Enzyme design. Structure first.
Site, short mmCIF file in Angstrom:
data_model
loop_
_atom_site.label_atom_id
_atom_site.label_comp_id
_atom_site.label_asym_id
_atom_site.label_seq_id
_atom_site.Cartn_x
_atom_site.Cartn_y
_atom_site.Cartn_z
N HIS B 13 0.54 -1.11 -0.01
CA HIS B 13 0.16 0.29 -0.25
C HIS B 13 0.83 1.41 -0.10
O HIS B 13 0.50 2.30 -0.90
CB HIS B 13 -1.01 -0.04 1.09
CG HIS B 13 -2.07 -1.10 0.79
ND1 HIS B 13 -3.40 -0.88 0.79
CD2 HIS B 13 -2.25 -2.37 0.81
CE1 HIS B 13 -4.13 -1.79 0.65
NE2 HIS B 13 -3.23 -2.78 0.78
N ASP B 110 -6.81 5.29 -0.06
CA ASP B 110 -6.51 4.02 -0.08
C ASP B 110 -8.02 3.31 -0.17
O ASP B 110 -8.73 3.88 0.26
CB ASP B 110 -5.60 3.64 0.97
CG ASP B 110 -5.18 2.15 0.64
OD1 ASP B 110 -5.58 1.55 -0.07
OD2 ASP B 110 -4.16 1.69 1.52
#
Ligand SMILES: O=c1ccn([C@@H]2O[C@H](COP(=O)(O)OP(=O)(O)O)[C@@H](O)[C@H]2O)c(=O)[nH]1
Ligand SMILES: O=c1ccn([C@@H]2O[C@H](COP(=O)(O)OP(=O)(O)O)[C@@H](O)[C@H]2O)c(=O)[nH]1
Ligand SMILES: O=c1ccn([C@@H]2O[C@H](COP(=O)(O)OP(=O)(O)O)[C@@H](O)[C@H]2O)c(=O)[nH]1
Ligand SMILES: O=c1ccn([C@@H]2O[C@H](COP(=O)(O)OP(=O)(O)O)[C@@H](O)[C@H]2O)c(=O)[nH]1
Lengths: 444, 443, 444, 436
Positions: B13, B110
């Site tokens: 991520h 995200d």
């Protein structure tokens, strides 16, 4: 000197010198001034000039900022001033520590156009009234100012571009780079014009008689706050030059050639003027820059040729390097000026009333030539075009050089501009009153 | 235009968001990157500092997340547990975002934080965008999860996703089907709020996943924008390069299983047995300790001195963080072994390395499929789930040999490599879309 | 090796350095081995001056010094020079990690400024080093700080007042606006650091149990359980000072100082000077008038003028620059203190039982003023509010200036404060005993 | 050493000290051991012991849970439950546990935890086999009778009188019942159970637990001392003759009133035993205890200054008991202590103040380990005379049979301690079961 003010030029001689000029001017009017420079400088010349300025003016204070490393190829090719200007943005935040410690808090800050967008955050946290100084033509500045709506409006390049309250600008005057949206140069101007809204005022090195149409056009054009400061006064950097030959020459006999802080043309073309310069018979003072962009990169007078320097041994003298242009232009001996038409060079000539032979090479210089011709200050042939677009004649150039020396109508008109320019700096002048008014408005 | 990037926990991520952020900054947006502390892994913290010193004009917004508070979402993974901790604290950032000096035009969030972030900017003038770390094909499976969960009464073969080939049931992870587990709850909660997002960013190019990108567009996620492959922020000082320079081109086989994936104690010894048996030159990144880098404090006492001596001529075994993108670029690496986490996968594709596919957990199996589909690499389905399965030396070695010598793959892999280049080019779709996107940002 | 090694890490400003230097000296007396972490360059001359001087006085304590790295974009709205450095040091705290690991005599523990506790806490964890925080301000303000995350997060309410949880409500009017705005550094730094406190072994506060029993409890019950009042920190200690005081009758002199970091409005200064003249009290006036930095405040008496000085010469003396505050308060002549109520000065006034007239300017100071009124230390006028944003008339000031000098019950009350302060210093006293207790755990 | 293990005790040294010994024992057997602790710790001593333990054993890792906001020890046991989820991150980052051994008190909370992070879990009981069954049979007993009777029977266990049983445990309303009953139900999840006992000490007790559905109980008693070495303390111990010294310790907490304590202090001089007395001021808290030896009186100290020494605070019990000088032990009878006495073969006198201890006293009696007087009862309930005590106190010194019986008990304890014996054998086996 109660009020505290700073001016922050970013890069280039054309940008740097005027801001110093604004500062000296501001100091003269009871302002306390710090001048902000960011290092390392692109050119050896910029620092050389800066060092003298502080030595010359003790009361004004140097406020350096050291640049941080960067590596972005998004900017096309490798022209250092856009890179330098771009780097300045990368390190601009470094400014904040510097401004927090100022002894008498800055009443206002004057910021070069190129980084007006980055400073804005800085100008909201520290609430400093922020101003800008324009090194370009008001007519040329009018074009940038209206560029965003005009860039939004079409996809192709037309014969003539119309800025709303001004005479249409021929596309030939406009740079290619300006026209294509994809190109970065377009990006830098568009964003920055937007940031003008934040600024308290916009200052340009031109005066109202001089660009009457444009200055007003700008007024109703979304740039309400523009102040015609100019012409910017002499730096008073006396002195570093020996001119025994100039003194010998008769008043207004000698022709001065400068193509700007950077070189403007190819050698083959350059030799052509030199050949044409001989045909004219004008006495001359020529400043030649071997390196088109950087003073540091030039270790080249090979280009003119061996025969020519000896041939004009008594007719004229040339300097390879840097000389004081305004100091030379104020001499009685100089009577004609051939310039690249950068706005600072054009404005200085108008202030001293020296007839110009316009030979624009790149950028905004072509548009400044149109102002030079409209003003009647100088003679310009539009058909010469950009540098290396066409190779213009030795014989062709000579006719134009002969006209500048022997056209009395230009001299009468050039003489008027000097008087017009002088009158605006007089106590009743709009330009002096506007600068005096702006200084009055600055808060303790 | 001010854009803020909000990555979750994990270098998978973290790496993509920073990479994009650098790209955005290069293209001239004002960029802020949101980080929170503490971070689970040492690399994330170390990386962030490096990234910022390299990119000075990007603002760093740091918030300390609240202590882990929970009910539900059975989670046995440290990176996933941190994601829950970030998600439960995102609603406390509304006060800070409202007062920022250069206000944010938009947030690129995200995927995991999209639901909480969408609520956060509801009454603020900020567009919400989501960046997807994983492949487009996995996104099709994510979109179908409600339909998959509702009509999933039977354990038989594969489920046909509507606009592309059906996926085997073995590929779908068992955790995704269990609603109690965090992986499922987070996937489901975020897909529901994707409709409140202005656009969804993906790390695949149109050439790489034409069917997957097209299938999602007609399947209700009509705002998908491929921007892949993401470009490295090329900031690096430490050099571990030297051994490779000694190596002949293409000889070396690179084995790595991502930031936080570890093999079995029986698997590490069986994989090592295969590397010796194959006879191939190799580079091994050993992450025996587990996900967290800090607790994986062991130092090559996994194999023993006996093994290193045997392999020293043909291999280098490194335990620690390695500059993967650089290694892959090297002439020496002609093979890659991957868990097929997407970011590795995209990198393999951009640099044209043949890939040997070996999923351990989550989306890896589907992505492994994509990798096989495009010719990027060879995948053995029978191997099934790493961490649920053990493969012997004989089986592993033969595959290792096979990948190294498939010339069709090496030729095939290159073709993908070319396509990845085109998309980055100004004509090429992926750069063009971002350029298209960037303009949009200015409001 | 078999001896506790304690490192002290102060932040920017005299107020944050001096409490740290003093403790470091206090610890050294009690057999600790002390190292001080200092960053160069200092924001101000005074901090630099003290450090070189301080280390001369205490040779045994190690001075560990680091370079100040460039400022970074971490999104804060700070326009202050001292706060900005605080920011700048913190970004670079992680850089120390290799060095702390490598020290000849290893660290056993370290104490961080509140501002660096969040950053400082991370470094220690990979080292077997205990972490403590020494907090510059009052317990009562500290009560506010802990609340702040809770306060910022939910209420978002402009009520007249709000109540801290185990302590009485604090008027909003006495809470700085900037603490409320999250983007600002002052709010942001308080919140991030407070949140990290759970990590610190103890938090040291320069206040004593008699002085803030109510606050001390209020904080303790709130779960930052480990609180260690150490107050008041002892002078670490001749100089070219003022003998003007030696010629003045006892209690006849009024001392005005707004600390090292506060400038005053020129309007504010003019009114304040005028007030002294009407009041007729003998005075010593210190002008930090100019900037926060002593380096950039070059203004001399150009701020008060020539006539004011000659007229007042018999009445009082005004000095611009550093004054040895401890020595001056100690002097028998000083009868009253006009203070901005920063904790370091507030604690000092308490130590010497000098009556305080409270005029808080910014930040923590209003909360500080209230306790000063509460403990019977001083007189504070609420309606005056914030010095920075409000201006008070000479007559109101003069009438008040008289009251503190003339009120004799306050002088009695201030003495009561003094005796209590004396009580803690003694071996019997809890604060000294607490410190001795702290040292023994240090010595594991 | 392949296997990796972690221990978790919530509170009291009643649980922590045994757990640590469990931790050390496990390390000896080739286990990677991690000890999980709760902070802040209720007692300064509890905190004190931990730092020493890690420092003494470098290779045992410490993991801690910071805690979020009646008896302090019981309430804290309650708090650990609140914050149990905090455990979740810790397990996730571990360099993964082959098994975790957890405190009885919080087993119910963890059940959810074990199931998500698949970890075989165990609990170790610090109480006797006889008492554990009373906890163990308690849940059925409470619902079925709901009454007070002189004696109560656990299926295969000889009934022990109510008089031994703690009153609070009897009340359904009480917090204590909920914790005990609930936890046993949770007892089902664990793959093993451990108690500090050996079969020989309570064959009857161990069996009933096996009979009563605690099929997985494992007795690993006695637990080996985890200890410091070597400090030159008690020059007052080495000096005396063997078995000349009576060591008195009422707990890891205080147990009786100053006047009741004064009667034993007066009884001690009449008894004539040389003594080392561990006197704790705090009824339950070491940090709370800030009283000097003024409960006994100045006079007592002057008279006996040569005869015996009084230590206010803590001491190393195993270290002291092992000494040749010690020949008598007076115990509050906490099981951990009682077990220590049997392993060290030192005669005991049983004076249990509270809780499980009175039942523990009963076990001592069946064993022959020590002399006990039942009538004395729950502490502070009644006043027991100085004259009455001495006769029992002297009897403890001068009883030949007791020395013999005690000698066997130590002998019996070792046999299980040795490799052939079951307690050693199970440990070997459980570790073997543990899977990487
Ligand atoms: O030898 C030289 C060359 C240039 N200039 C000065 O350079 C400034 C900038 O020139 P301009 O703005 O016309 O163009 P640029 O060099 O930036 O293209 C003007 O003040 C010129 O007088 C000068 O003083 N001496
Ligand atoms: O030792 C390592 C391991 C991983 N990576 C980088 O981590 C990125 C993300 O890994 P991926 O998403 O492929 O797998 P994950 O960590 O998410 O499971 C890859 O681009 C690698 O470049 C690295 O640089 N060094
Ligand atoms: O001229 C001065 C001004 C300040 N101080 C000392 O500086 C310390 C810190 O001041 P404080 O924290 O009270 O206020 P600040 O400087 O932080 O605003 C106090 O001990 C003052 O006595 C001093 O010695 N001389
Ligand atoms: O001064 C003391 C008192 C007790 N203990 C230890 O306390 C532990 C447990 O005591 P027990 O559980 O038997 O009693 P409680 O804690 O229930 O009062 C035993 O291991 C003893 O060695 C000790 O070491 N020193």
């Amino acid at each position: 000197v109660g009020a505290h003010i700073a001016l922050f030029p970013c890069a280039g001689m054309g940008h740097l010198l005027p801001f110093l000029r604004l500062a000296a001017m501001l100091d003269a009017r009871g302002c306390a001034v710090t001048v902000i420079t960011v290092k390392p400088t692109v050119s050896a010349a910029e620092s050389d000039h800066l060092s003298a300025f502080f030595t010359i003016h003790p009361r004004i204070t140097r406020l350096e900022f050291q640049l941080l490393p960067y590596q972005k190829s998004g900017l096309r090719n490798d022209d250092p001033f856009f890179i330098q200007m771009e780097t300045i943005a990368t390190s601009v935040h470094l400014l904040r520590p510097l401004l927090s410690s100022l002894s008498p808090p800055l009443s206002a800050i004057v910021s070069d156009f190129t980084l007006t967008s980055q400073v804005t955050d800085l100008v909201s946290d520290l609430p400093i009234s922020t101003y800008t100084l324009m090194t370009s033509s008001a007519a040329f500045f009018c074009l940038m100012a209206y560029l965003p709506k005009l860039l939004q409006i079409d996809v192709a390049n037309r014969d003539a571009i119309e800025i709303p309250d001004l005479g249409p600008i021929s596309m030939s005057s406009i740079p290619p780079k300006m026209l294509d949206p994809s190109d970065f140069f377009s990006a830098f101007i568009s964003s920055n014009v937007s940031s003008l809204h934040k600024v308290k005022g916009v200052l340009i090195n031109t005066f109202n008689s001089f660009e009457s149409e444009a200055i007003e056009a700008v007024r109703r054009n979304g740039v309400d706050h523009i102040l015609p400061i100019g012409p910017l006064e002499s730096y008073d950097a006396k002195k570093a030059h020996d001119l025994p030959w100039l003194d010998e020459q008769p008043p207004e006999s000698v022709l001065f050639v400068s193509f700007g802080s950077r070189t403007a043309l190819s050698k083959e073309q350059i030799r052509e003027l030199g050949a044409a310069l001989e045909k004219s018979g004008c006495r001359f003072l020529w400043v030649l820059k071997g390196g088109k962009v950087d003073k540091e990169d030039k270790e080249e007078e090979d280009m003119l040729g061996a025969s020519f320097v000896e041939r004009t041994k008594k007719k004229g003298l040339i300097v390879k390097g840097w000389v004081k242009q305004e100091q030379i232009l104020a001499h009685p001996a100089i009577g004609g000026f051939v310039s690249h038409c950068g706005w600072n060079s054009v404005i200085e000539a108008a202030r001293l009333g020296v007839p110009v032979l316009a030979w624009p090479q790149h950028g905004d210089q072509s548009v400044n030539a149109g102002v030079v011709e409209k003003a009647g200050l100088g003679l310009w042939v539009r058909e010469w075009g950009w540098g290396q677009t066409k190779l213009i004649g030795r014989e062709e150039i000579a006719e134009k050089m002969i006209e500048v020396m022997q056209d009395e109508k230009l001299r009468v008109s050039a003489g008027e501009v000097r008087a017009k320019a002088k009158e605006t700096r007089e106590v009743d002048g709009d330009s002096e009153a506007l600068l005096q008014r702006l200084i009055h408005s600055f808060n303790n």
